[PDB]
Symmetry: C4
Subunit: 342 residues, 4 copies
């Protein structure tokens, strides 16, 4: 038993500005999710039963990103949901697969529906089940793009690449709704996790996704600058009109339900998530607009016209909790709504 290092989350770090010749409106946000799949913006909606069904997946795709359709539904329903996305004009669609007895049956149905990428997503991606699962899928569908997760170490990146994964998803315990670190003791602060895993993925030619723990548009800039090809979000999208669930009103405020897929409610037991509510945000398009503007602003400050040189030119400093207080607005009574800050 040894203590390796201090590991950082997004709130621990800030990016140092670079000499720039590019204005935010001039930068480009295209990214390769896999070698075969390009996205116009590097944003993905989480594969959760309170975040992404076909309604969300279609809107994400029209905005330039992609939704991963959750697997808490019949194989038949999930193929139906993937098919609904694909027939809505050649939109990209993903679907979640689990390490289950019917894994291949479910894969078979979503490929029949022409899914563009599957996510073999589990609480612990660095495992015999996932590794063998990836190898079976690629042995039957060599061309099927496969994201495998979730992981938090460079050894996991190497092992899953070696299995045939086309992309790996990073994130153990940083989710807004996640208790894995509290109930199991396990996880890696997400900025260090993405940085160390992306470094290994660059050496092997495999992209990594930064999944969970993102709250503000500036957090996405950090995750991309740390080397992720894309950022996955549940909380930021669960309050949008296109996520599942009705709008509930209470004391003049509107809400949507959001819960971990390891929460008691979603599994219906020793849960690794919680259940609750988040503010209703309106249409996804308004949220995406603010995320993309802040990302383009950060790339302007970093002198990055596109996303590759962003990682190469990224220098972080660590801030203390007093630095964090300086970074947020302070010593002001904010009386007006800001569209990208709360």
């Amino acid at each position: 038993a040894r203590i390796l290092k201090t590991a950082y989350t997004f709130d621990d770090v800030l990016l140092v500005p670079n000499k720039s010749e590019v204005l935010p409106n001039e930068v480009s946000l295209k990214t390769q999710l896999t070698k075969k799949i390009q996205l116009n913006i590097p944003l993905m909606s989480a594969s959760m039963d309170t975040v992404t069904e076909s309604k969300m997946a279609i809107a994400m795709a029209r905005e330039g990103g992609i939704g991963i359709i959750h697997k808490n539904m019949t194989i038949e329903d999930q193929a139906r949901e993937v098919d609904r996305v694909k027939r809505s004009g050649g939109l990209l669609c993903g679907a979640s697969i689990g390490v289950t007895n019917d894994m291949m049956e479910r894969v078979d149905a979503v490929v029949k529906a022409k899914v563009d990428v599957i996510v073999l997503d589990t609480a612990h991606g660095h495992s015999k089940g996932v590794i063998e699962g990836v190898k079976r899928i690629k042995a039957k569908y060599p061309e099927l793009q496969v994201i495998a997760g979730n992981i938090a170490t460079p050894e996991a990146v190497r092992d899953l690449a070696e299995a045939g994964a086309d992309c790996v998803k990073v994130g153990i315990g940083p989710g807004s709704i996640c208790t894995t670190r509290i109930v199991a003791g396990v996880g890696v602060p997400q900025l260090t996790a993405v940085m160390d895993c992306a470094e290994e993925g660059k050496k092997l030619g495999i992209p990594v996704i930064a999944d969970g723990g993102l709250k503000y548009s500036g957090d996405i800039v950090k995750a991309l600058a740390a080397g992720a090809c894309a950022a996955m979000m549940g909380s930021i999208f669960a309050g949008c009109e296109e996520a599942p669930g009705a709008i509930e009103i209470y004391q003049g405020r509107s809400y949507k339900v959001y819960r971990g897929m390891g929460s008691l409610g979603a599994m219906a037991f020793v849960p690794e998530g919680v259940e609750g509510r988040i503010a209703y945000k309106g249409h996804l398009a308004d949220t995406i607009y603010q995320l993309i503007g802040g990302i383009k602003s950060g790339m302007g400050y970093l002198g990055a016209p596109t996303l590759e040189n962003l990682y190469e030119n990224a220098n972080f400093v660590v801030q203390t909790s007093a630095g964090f207080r300086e970074s947020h607005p302070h010593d002001i009574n904010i009386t007006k709504e800001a569209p990208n800050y709360s």
Copy 2:
């Protein structure tokens, strides 16, 4: 030129660190939680209830033993009552039982009584185990009862592990200042953050062949995983069990909520003074079995994440990272209004 620097080492508590996932070929339902409390005493689960007058009498010790762990009967009662309590556990189906002993004029009379009642382990229990009185107490007890299993505590340094081991202790108990009801660090200025204490003591124990117990400061199942991964053979809890039906004390209702009393053994109320503990209320939890179910499930999850089929394998292959207070905020659920109870998480 090169300058002089003050050598101050940082020590960590459970909330300072996280376990890094390992490659895993084991599912949580396949791991084994057996542990050796002492070379002679095996537990089916690595959990102990604290020797406190608001946590463990015979009712709790019986339930802990039936769940696969052990309870330590507290000594805030007559010698005859403590022997009766141990005896009641031992008559309830050969269950394991422990009893707390103090550095007192009547120490051996109390030891004799609980030995007569067939106690399986005594805990020579003190605020400062790395002391002349505890060292001599262990020697005297082992000279009279060479086969009697003795835990000695509490301590926080490898030197204390070495000295108590040389005195004849079969196991040592680590924890100066981490307990939820404890003020030792505040009033005396003394203690060691518990994750570092357990790690540094356990590593010395591993080299001497003596196990160590991680006593105090545990709040969530994941904290126990950290303590076991750091090398502790078992985890001792007061607060986590004190709200259970099987703990001493009536269930008290106030403004629609149910409470039980929990207090330090060094608080005024327990000692009845310069106290080193406080007295208060915690939420009623219901039956011990439901709390144990959640704790065990969390430990098994952690071992799955670390690929550990056994607790020795957990310790041998565990790596930690340090998190900052921002890391801690990410680790807990954040930016959500939690609306439903979770059986293993409360804020």
Copy 3:
């Protein structure tokens, strides 16, 4: 083939404290004079922010009368800004500064404030380490070789060097520390201010170019830290936005007096945002606030044995405090029942 990296820990004012020095100088014996630029001297090292809720001619006149300087904001027509500079210049030859953006009409605005005899212009931008600001400085110094130019905002030594080479007479440091700023949150970018000022001032001293510590200052002691770290001057928005001389009416809500204060990057000021809009306490007249700030600075210089600001820089030593140190540093374990004029909660 470079890779992303974590360079170091960087500190804000609340992270550090100045170690007392042997002193042979009482606080009333110290001199607060400073060179804003080689050409311009200030009797006290304080500047009011170039914002439409902080500085117009009323504030700039009062700042200059106190011995500092105000920068007239550019959220107005070119003609009105020229008029505002002119009102300041007329009142006894007081120093005045004016804000300029990287815009298509940049040189037209410069022309008009030069005509009004502005003493310094600030090429004010969110990201001063940029081609636009560099080319802007060069163009201005080509048409007006002796016009003093401050360029900002920046946070790195590289930026100091690049703007000095472009011809800047002074550089302004601050990416993200402002009270009303959200740059670090929405874009992910910035450098904690004490470290940003120390590292930029270190480069500036090597090149003979001063640097301004802009943003994030809350108490008079924070200004001492900024000056000890090598800044020639401190610029404040929040500390001045509540004064009588700031723009905006005095608003009363539930027995408390307020004034509006907002980021220039806020939706309201621009009518994707990087600032917020709110209200701060009304503080009465600028003179009362400056008195407390100056007294605090003089006290600090007494503690550090510094008769002059250059001596303060040369002999200042900092320690880092933890959040527990910070709790010690503030009053603690006391129910404060009387207002202190230089301390609020």
Copy 4:
């Protein structure tokens, strides 16, 4: 301009238990305030007009410590105060002195009242005025014991000892009522200040006082283990019935006034370096001292120290994070009973 190191306050550190052959009841709290002045317990009350006049100094001395009579009164009044303490049984008494035009005449008057020790008390002890003040006092009164302060660095210890100080007082900005670090930006977190200065004092044979920022008895143990010969407190004693000021009731709670000497109110008796407020009434000094001493004795038992010197020689600190601090305090308990040595 450079960052030297991280500096720590009491809440940043904990003492590691030692092997112990001494029980808390077997330890000795005796200490040398100066080479000439022994205290039976290592505690002093602050020279503040809401903490120490003759009533508090007499009570402090009878408990084995010492009070420093504040100077916010006429020279004649301060002499009478000192005189009351000395006539109450040869009790030890101290008196504060400022860097003032009447400095020597104030010293003359308290010397005639037979003060045991004067404290050349100032915001910045590492200054020419204090250095020359000490030299002048020791020139006229070579045997008069002189504490000089306040300071926060080893260099200040050296310069003050060279001036002739018999003891130096450490604390720039730790006071509960102090705003020095906020308004002037200056100070050193108190545990590091005491450790650095006391180590310098030990080399020179000059003791150092840990003055300010103490909240709990364990904070004093840390100050003494860091090498301080004594601890000085305002807040911990200002609520005692022997402190100046009436007991005031507000909404069923009892309070006394407590304020910095550099607050407006105290200076009026303007850029201040302190605040004014109220703290809880604590009853008689004896009950507070009893808890402080018990906690110190417990700490010394944990460290196996029969004496304050052995405590310093064998003390090892570790640093704790804010998560460590949350563990060190009681946590996850609704406290429902008063404890005499713990509040929050």
